[PDB]
RNA sequence: UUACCGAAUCUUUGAACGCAAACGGCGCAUGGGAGAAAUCCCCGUGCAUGCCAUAUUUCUCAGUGUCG
RNA sequence: UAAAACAUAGGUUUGUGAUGCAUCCAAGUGGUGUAUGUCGCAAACUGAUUUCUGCCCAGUGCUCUGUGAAGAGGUUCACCGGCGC
RNA sequence: ACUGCUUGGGAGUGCAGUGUCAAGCUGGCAGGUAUGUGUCUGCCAAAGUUAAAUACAGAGUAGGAAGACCGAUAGCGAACAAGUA
RNA sequence: CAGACCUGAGUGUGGCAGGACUACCCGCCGAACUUAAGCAUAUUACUAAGCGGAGGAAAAGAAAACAACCGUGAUUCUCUCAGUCAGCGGCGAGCGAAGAGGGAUCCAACUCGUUGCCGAAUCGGUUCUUAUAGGAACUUGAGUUGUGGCAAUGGUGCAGGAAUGGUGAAA
């Protein structure tokens, strides 16, 4: 995000402390990286083969 | 630099978003036991500063503590002897509340060895410190150079001895130099050292 | 001085209710759905002291 | 030596010099300096007149090392100069040189009759020392 | 005991050994870090000790 | 307190003494001599144990702090990184060859600096490394010169007054 | 026989911990024993709570928590 | 010291509707009256019955009716915040 | 800030409680008399480990060396089946 | 809805905790007697008792230290500083240090988090090599809600020693 090499980012909706990611939407909005929140860290999980993914 | 964001997000504890998150938790934490283990810290970045690592044998605990001053446990509130030593309500515990939470936990669970604690939340009645206990006999701990000191018997109950960072705070050891000379190896050590009647062998 | 008897009854030691032979609390029936939407017939069985 | 105590002399004389009447008690007056302003008032006022009170400005955290300015008089500079070196010191000739920090002195008070010149080398000097020291044909040279 | 040390000889079962047969020391010698894990040092330290070995010396 | 006796201030009103009642606060030195041997045995026990190696590692010549002592030149606590550099030694190599290092010292003056680079540079000559396979000023004596004219006091006192009333001469 | 120390032996207890306890009481499970017309009886081992780890062939689950 | 005292019944008075009253506890989603609920509970005084308890509410007791200003700031001054009757 | 303990620590030494709660784009903390301000000096807190020199002031284990000490009402309570009867 | 995760249970499994000791030591707790010729602040004393904890020492320790110097340089200790022309204090009784300095000790220093560059390189378990190697293969098991790296040894063999013991003189 900061290096803005990312060209899309996928914040997960739910997170144990949302604080982990709570800032992230503002940070993509600042680097003007496209981003989307999505329903579950479990789905970013399996999408990455991890059992949960806070982000992708 | 995700820590840098998550660290300054928590520096705004009074911000209405952080004030809301904290609100729901303190609600959520009131309806939980005085000690509660967590699979993860509420504050991953803060726990990790204090030596927590997401590894086997590191475990986190959220230990509640009632706020407000100590009431000294004299019967019927009466106090005997000199008027100075009177006073029930207003004298304060000379011990930290991170200390008391590190000590509640480490005494309930002698299985473990508390590393540090950090403030998590605090409603009107309670403060919550999430402790980072290490389990001395997890193999991951035993074999990691950065942490296996905790395994050594000298730290069995560090917290009860006021060795943890909280227990060094109220113990005055956050000050070197002239602000902690009467305090400095320990208040007790300072006392021996000054109150000894040295007798040089030839005087 | 020394503790007043009004204060000692609050220890509720010697000063507790007896009640070994008490039958239990004398209350109304639990406020069932039946109480709230109908009635429950109970026959009186015996009037105790 | 227990042999020499008059404890040992008056073994047998029942009251050990404390008197038959007016018996040797304990603390016939208070512990230590008790009643310094009462029943021992005549005592401190006679002997320790300034004992009670406060006199001046406080100096919180005094550091005596910065304050360290020990003094040697002109009259005592023979203590430092070698007697052999000091042998011939005409004012118009060569002079023994006397660093005073080396010898542990800081200021140079100009007391008595110096008459043998020396180039005293010291941190401080009296108004009268540098004058006397010059009039003898010597010279203080300031150091630190 | 000489035939149960025989049954449980070998690393694979040594953790499964009856503890009457397991080498009792003191409660502390057993719970203490073993040298196997005591002398562990972080990889940086391991390298910064090879790079500057306690080279022997004398001063004439 | 009857008589001319000085007012006594014998701070012994605490239970330092050991009686039936108290475990006293007392530090006698009865083992002083035994300890003197213990250390003495142990330093000798140590030098035997590390024969080539000097009993004590190389230390810097440092200035003492205050005005009371700045004339004194005590042994320091390890060389500056700048000193070890100038002597050409490597600072993390230095301790392994018996040279104390001290990251905290600053070479505030070129004097203590150069006294030490000479010291390490002198030590590295004396050093024998098995392959893995205090200086100060003095003065003699001299004729007095221009010194005879000037009063050093009004020189000393201007310079003292200059600082002493420096803040009070600004407002005027 | 003495001295020492490696192998063991170490009864009832006791933190005491299977449950009790002014009871040399009583269990459940596991294996043994004797025995006996099985029931009884003795014995060994396990069986406290809390917590950490783990389920290494990844245990079984619970939630109008989140989703799919 | 067995009384003349205490108790006593009887009398009165006070609190109090559970958010209670009295009250224990260092402390708590702790405790006692209260397994109760005014014909109850808690507190006091008097001391069976008969008879009567006059006058005094003066005293005492009980009851009832942060925000501005100045200052460089520390600060200072000002305004609002249970009594008296 | 308030309170409380604490300290030689003094308009606060440390601490605790509660309220309040930073900074890091003239940073922060110390610089032993408060405040605002300007210089300068040392430092870089709120995470962690760490031998030695030190304690053993009613401990232990295994040994050892002693004494200008006591000498059986003394020295440990205990020279003995003494923390025993 | 099947599952998935999150949260939480239940067993199995492998461990630990609890007790003792507690002279010293670390944390809290916390008197009064006494002294002040009374006594409340003070003092006793930040002591005793009380509670909780360690170890063979502990605690402390690597600078948010001192100084104000020609500057020193972790901690502990010690002598001194100093019963102080510090300071506290019904400024009374009383209490009372610190810098520096001599010394002991000291080839004494390091590690995280973070930052940056990477990004599972990690860990656990299984097997394996004569090895629960700092090895190797293998593992979704944990872990990217961040392990770890970078910059700011295990196995087997021989010996000697030391140290303890065993032996051992004259007349
Ligand atoms: Mg006579
Ligand atoms: Mg006499
Ligand atoms: Mg007489
Ligand atoms: Mg007399
Ligand atoms: Mg008389
Ligand atoms: Mg004074
Ligand atoms: Mg049992
Ligand atoms: Mg009566
Ligand atoms: Mg009547
Ligand atoms: Mg009337
Ligand atoms: Mg005090
Ligand atoms: Mg910092
Ligand atoms: Mg005897
Ligand atoms: Mg214990
Ligand atoms: Mg008195
Ligand atoms: Mg005690
Ligand atoms: Mg330690
Ligand atoms: Mg430590
Ligand atoms: Mg130092
Ligand atoms: Mg004191
Ligand atoms: Mg990391």
CSV table of N, CA and C in Angstrom, one decimal, chain F residues 70-164:
chain,number,residue,atom,x,y,z
F,70,UNK,N,40.0,17.8,38.5
F,70,UNK,CA,40.3,17.8,37.0
F,70,UNK,C,41.8,17.8,36.8
F,71,UNK,N,42.5,18.2,37.8
F,71,UNK,CA,44.0,18.0,37.8
F,71,UNK,C,44.4,16.5,37.9
F,72,UNK,N,43.5,15.7,38.4
F,72,UNK,CA,43.9,14.3,38.5
F,72,UNK,C,43.6,13.5,37.3
F,73,UNK,N,44.3,12.4,37.1
F,73,UNK,CA,44.3,11.7,35.8
F,73,UNK,C,44.1,10.2,36.1
F,74,UNK,N,42.9,9.8,36.4
F,74,UNK,CA,42.6,8.5,36.8
F,74,UNK,C,42.5,7.5,35.6
F,75,UNK,N,42.6,6.2,35.9
F,75,UNK,CA,42.4,5.2,34.9
F,75,UNK,C,40.9,5.2,34.5
F,76,UNK,N,40.6,5.1,33.2
F,76,UNK,CA,39.3,5.3,32.7
F,76,UNK,C,38.5,4.0,32.6
F,77,UNK,N,37.5,3.9,31.8
F,77,UNK,CA,36.8,2.7,31.6
F,77,UNK,C,36.6,2.3,30.2
F,78,UNK,N,37.7,2.1,29.5
F,78,UNK,CA,37.5,1.7,28.1
F,78,UNK,C,37.6,2.9,27.2
F,79,UNK,N,38.2,2.6,26.0
F,79,UNK,CA,38.4,3.6,25.0
F,79,UNK,C,37.2,4.0,24.2
F,80,UNK,N,37.3,5.2,23.6
F,80,UNK,CA,36.3,5.7,22.8
F,80,UNK,C,36.4,5.0,21.4
F,81,UNK,N,35.2,5.0,20.7
F,81,UNK,CA,35.2,4.4,19.4
F,81,UNK,C,36.2,5.2,18.5
F,82,UNK,N,36.2,6.5,18.7
F,82,UNK,CA,37.1,7.4,17.9
F,82,UNK,C,38.6,7.2,18.3
F,83,UNK,N,38.8,6.7,19.5
F,83,UNK,CA,40.2,6.4,19.9
F,83,UNK,C,40.6,5.1,19.3
F,84,UNK,N,39.8,4.1,19.3
F,84,UNK,CA,40.1,2.8,18.8
F,84,UNK,C,40.2,3.0,17.3
F,85,UNK,N,39.5,3.8,16.6
F,85,UNK,CA,39.6,4.0,15.2
F,85,UNK,C,40.9,4.6,14.9
F,86,UNK,N,41.3,5.7,15.6
F,86,UNK,CA,42.5,6.4,15.3
F,86,UNK,C,43.7,5.6,15.5
F,87,UNK,N,43.6,4.6,16.5
F,87,UNK,CA,44.7,3.8,16.8
F,87,UNK,C,44.7,2.6,15.7
F,88,UNK,N,43.7,2.6,15.0
F,88,UNK,CA,43.5,1.6,13.9
F,88,UNK,C,43.0,0.3,14.4
F,89,UNK,N,42.7,0.2,15.7
F,89,UNK,CA,42.0,-1.0,16.2
F,89,UNK,C,40.6,-1.0,15.8
F,90,UNK,N,40.0,-2.2,15.7
F,90,UNK,CA,38.5,-2.4,15.5
F,90,UNK,C,37.8,-2.5,16.8
F,91,UNK,N,36.8,-1.7,17.1
F,91,UNK,CA,36.2,-1.5,18.4
F,91,UNK,C,35.6,-2.8,19.0
F,92,UNK,N,35.0,-3.7,18.1
F,92,UNK,CA,34.6,-5.0,18.6
F,92,UNK,C,35.6,-6.0,18.6
F,93,UNK,N,36.8,-5.7,18.0
F,93,UNK,CA,37.9,-6.6,18.0
F,93,UNK,C,38.7,-6.3,19.3
F,94,UNK,N,38.6,-5.0,19.7
F,94,UNK,CA,39.5,-4.5,20.8
F,94,UNK,C,39.2,-5.3,22.1
F,95,UNK,N,38.0,-5.5,22.5
F,95,UNK,CA,37.9,-6.3,23.7
F,95,UNK,C,38.5,-7.7,23.6
F,96,UNK,N,38.5,-8.3,22.5
F,96,UNK,CA,39.0,-9.7,22.3
F,96,UNK,C,40.5,-9.7,22.4
F,97,UNK,N,41.1,-8.6,22.3
F,97,UNK,CA,42.6,-8.5,22.5
F,97,UNK,C,42.9,-7.8,23.8
F,98,UNK,N,41.9,-7.6,24.6
F,98,UNK,CA,42.2,-7.1,25.9
F,98,UNK,C,42.1,-5.6,26.1
F,99,UNK,N,41.6,-4.9,25.1
F,99,UNK,CA,41.4,-3.5,25.1
F,99,UNK,C,40.0,-3.1,25.5
F,100,UNK,N,39.8,-2.4,26.7
F,100,UNK,CA,38.5,-2.0,27.1
F,100,UNK,C,37.9,-1.0,26.1
F,101,UNK,N,36.6,-1.2,25.9
F,101,UNK,CA,35.9,-0.2,25.0
F,101,UNK,C,34.8,0.5,25.9
F,102,UNK,N,34.4,1.7,25.5
F,102,UNK,CA,33.4,2.4,26.2
F,102,UNK,C,32.6,3.3,25.2
F,103,UNK,N,31.4,2.9,24.8
F,103,UNK,CA,30.7,3.5,23.8
F,103,UNK,C,30.2,4.9,24.2
F,104,UNK,N,30.0,5.1,25.5
F,104,UNK,CA,29.6,6.3,26.1
F,104,UNK,C,30.5,7.5,26.2
F,105,UNK,N,31.8,7.2,26.3
F,105,UNK,CA,32.7,8.3,26.4
F,105,UNK,C,32.8,9.1,25.1
F,106,UNK,N,32.9,10.4,25.3
F,106,UNK,CA,33.0,11.4,24.2
F,106,UNK,C,34.5,11.9,24.3
F,107,UNK,N,35.1,12.1,23.2
F,107,UNK,CA,36.4,12.8,23.2
F,107,UNK,C,36.1,14.3,23.1
F,108,UNK,N,35.7,14.9,24.2
F,108,UNK,CA,35.4,16.3,24.1
F,108,UNK,C,36.6,17.2,23.8
F,109,UNK,N,37.8,16.7,24.1
F,109,UNK,CA,39.0,17.5,23.8
F,109,UNK,C,40.1,16.7,23.1
F,110,UNK,N,40.8,17.3,22.2
F,110,UNK,CA,41.8,16.6,21.4
F,110,UNK,C,42.9,16.0,22.3
F,111,UNK,N,43.0,16.6,23.5
F,111,UNK,CA,44.1,16.2,24.4
F,111,UNK,C,43.9,14.8,25.0
F,112,UNK,N,42.8,14.5,25.5
F,112,UNK,CA,42.5,13.2,26.1
F,112,UNK,C,42.5,12.2,25.0
F,113,UNK,N,41.9,12.6,23.9
F,113,UNK,CA,41.9,11.9,22.7
F,113,UNK,C,43.3,11.4,22.4
F,114,UNK,N,44.2,12.3,22.0
F,114,UNK,CA,45.5,11.9,21.6
F,114,UNK,C,46.4,11.3,22.6
F,115,UNK,N,46.1,11.5,23.9
F,115,UNK,CA,46.8,10.7,24.9
F,115,UNK,C,46.5,9.3,24.9
F,116,UNK,N,45.3,9.0,24.5
F,116,UNK,CA,44.8,7.6,24.4
F,116,UNK,C,45.2,6.9,23.1
F,117,UNK,N,45.1,7.6,21.9
F,117,UNK,CA,45.4,6.9,20.7
F,117,UNK,C,46.8,6.5,20.7
F,118,UNK,N,47.7,7.3,21.4
F,118,UNK,CA,49.0,6.9,21.7
F,118,UNK,C,49.1,5.7,22.7
F,119,UNK,N,48.1,5.6,23.5
F,119,UNK,CA,48.1,4.6,24.5
F,119,UNK,C,47.7,3.2,23.9
F,120,UNK,N,46.7,3.2,23.1
F,120,UNK,CA,46.4,2.0,22.3
F,120,UNK,C,47.4,1.7,21.3
F,121,UNK,N,48.0,2.7,20.7
F,121,UNK,CA,49.0,2.6,19.7
F,121,UNK,C,50.3,2.0,20.3
F,122,UNK,N,50.5,2.5,21.5
F,122,UNK,CA,51.6,1.9,22.4
F,122,UNK,C,51.3,0.5,22.8
F,123,UNK,N,50.1,0.2,23.1
F,123,UNK,CA,49.7,-1.2,23.6
F,123,UNK,C,49.7,-2.2,22.5
F,124,UNK,N,49.5,-1.7,21.2
F,124,UNK,CA,49.5,-2.7,20.1
F,124,UNK,C,50.9,-3.0,19.7
F,125,UNK,N,51.9,-2.3,20.1
F,125,UNK,CA,53.2,-2.7,19.9
F,125,UNK,C,53.6,-3.8,20.9
F,126,UNK,N,53.3,-3.6,22.1
F,126,UNK,CA,53.6,-4.5,23.2
F,126,UNK,C,52.8,-5.8,23.0
F,127,UNK,N,51.6,-5.7,22.3
F,127,UNK,CA,50.7,-6.8,22.2
F,127,UNK,C,51.4,-8.0,21.4
F,128,UNK,N,51.2,-9.2,21.9
F,128,UNK,CA,51.5,-10.4,21.2
F,128,UNK,C,50.3,-11.2,21.1
F,129,UNK,N,49.8,-11.3,19.8
F,129,UNK,CA,48.5,-12.0,19.6
F,129,UNK,C,48.7,-13.4,19.1
F,130,UNK,N,48.3,-14.4,19.8
F,130,UNK,CA,48.6,-15.8,19.3
F,130,UNK,C,47.6,-16.0,18.2
F,131,UNK,N,48.2,-16.4,17.0
F,131,UNK,CA,47.4,-16.7,15.8
F,131,UNK,C,46.5,-17.8,16.1
F,132,UNK,N,45.3,-17.8,15.6
F,132,UNK,CA,44.3,-18.8,15.8
F,132,UNK,C,44.8,-20.1,15.2
F,133,UNK,N,45.7,-20.0,14.1
F,133,UNK,CA,46.4,-21.1,13.6
F,133,UNK,C,47.9,-21.1,14.0
F,134,UNK,N,50.5,7.4,33.4
F,134,UNK,CA,49.6,8.5,32.9
F,134,UNK,C,50.4,9.7,32.7
F,135,UNK,N,50.6,10.1,31.4
F,135,UNK,CA,51.3,11.4,31.1
F,135,UNK,C,50.6,12.7,31.5
F,136,UNK,N,51.4,13.6,31.9
F,136,UNK,CA,50.9,14.9,32.3
F,136,UNK,C,52.0,16.0,32.2
F,137,UNK,N,51.6,17.3,32.3
F,137,UNK,CA,52.5,18.4,32.3
F,137,UNK,C,53.5,18.5,33.5
F,138,UNK,N,54.6,19.1,33.3
F,138,UNK,CA,55.5,19.5,34.4
F,138,UNK,C,56.2,20.8,34.0
F,139,UNK,N,56.7,21.6,34.9
F,139,UNK,CA,57.5,22.8,34.6
F,139,UNK,C,58.8,22.8,35.4
F,140,UNK,N,59.8,23.4,34.8
F,140,UNK,CA,61.1,23.6,35.5
F,140,UNK,C,61.2,24.8,36.3
F,141,UNK,N,61.8,25.9,35.8
F,141,UNK,CA,61.9,27.1,36.5
F,141,UNK,C,62.4,28.2,35.6
F,142,UNK,N,62.0,29.5,35.8
F,142,UNK,CA,62.3,30.5,34.9
F,142,UNK,C,62.4,31.9,35.5
F,143,UNK,N,63.1,32.8,34.8
F,143,UNK,CA,63.1,34.2,35.1
F,143,UNK,C,61.7,34.8,35.0
F,144,UNK,N,61.3,35.6,35.9
F,144,UNK,CA,60.0,36.4,35.7
F,144,UNK,C,60.3,37.4,34.6
F,145,UNK,N,59.2,37.6,33.8
F,145,UNK,CA,59.4,38.4,32.6
F,145,UNK,C,58.5,39.7,32.6
F,146,UNK,N,57.4,39.6,31.9
F,146,UNK,CA,56.4,40.7,31.9
F,146,UNK,C,55.5,40.5,33.1
F,147,UNK,N,55.6,39.4,33.8
F,147,UNK,CA,54.8,39.0,34.9
F,147,UNK,C,54.9,40.0,36.0
F,148,UNK,N,56.0,40.7,36.1
F,148,UNK,CA,56.3,41.6,37.2
F,148,UNK,C,55.4,42.8,37.1
F,149,UNK,N,55.0,43.2,35.9
F,149,UNK,CA,54.2,44.4,35.8
F,149,UNK,C,52.7,44.2,36.2
F,150,UNK,N,52.1,43.3,35.4
F,150,UNK,CA,50.7,43.1,35.6
F,150,UNK,C,50.2,42.5,36.9
F,151,UNK,N,49.2,43.1,37.5
F,151,UNK,CA,48.6,42.5,38.6
F,151,UNK,C,47.6,41.4,38.1
F,152,UNK,N,47.8,40.2,38.5
F,152,UNK,CA,47.0,39.1,38.0
F,152,UNK,C,45.7,39.1,38.7
F,153,UNK,N,45.5,39.9,39.7
F,153,UNK,CA,44.3,39.9,40.5
F,153,UNK,C,43.2,40.7,39.8
F,154,UNK,N,43.6,41.9,39.4
F,154,UNK,CA,42.6,42.7,38.6
F,154,UNK,C,42.4,42.0,37.3
F,155,UNK,N,43.3,41.2,36.8
F,155,UNK,CA,43.1,40.4,35.7
F,155,UNK,C,42.1,39.3,36.1
F,156,UNK,N,42.4,38.6,37.2
F,156,UNK,CA,41.5,37.6,37.7
F,156,UNK,C,40.2,38.1,38.1
F,157,UNK,N,40.1,39.3,38.6
F,157,UNK,CA,38.9,39.8,39.1
F,157,UNK,C,38.0,40.4,38.1
F,158,UNK,N,38.6,40.9,37.0
F,158,UNK,CA,37.8,41.4,35.9
F,158,UNK,C,37.1,40.2,35.2
F,159,UNK,N,37.8,39.2,35.0
F,159,UNK,CA,37.3,38.0,34.3
F,159,UNK,C,36.3,37.2,35.2
F,160,UNK,N,36.4,37.4,36.5
F,160,UNK,CA,35.4,36.8,37.4
F,160,UNK,C,34.2,37.7,37.4
F,161,UNK,N,34.4,39.0,37.6
F,161,UNK,CA,33.3,39.9,37.6
F,161,UNK,C,32.6,40.0,36.3
F,162,UNK,N,33.4,39.7,35.2
F,162,UNK,CA,32.8,39.8,33.9
F,162,UNK,C,31.7,38.8,33.7
F,163,UNK,N,31.9,37.6,34.3
F,163,UNK,CA,31.0,36.6,34.3
F,163,UNK,C,29.9,36.8,35.3
F,164,UNK,N,30.4,37.2,36.5
F,164,UNK,CA,29.5,37.3,37.6
F,164,UNK,C,28.5,38.4,37.5
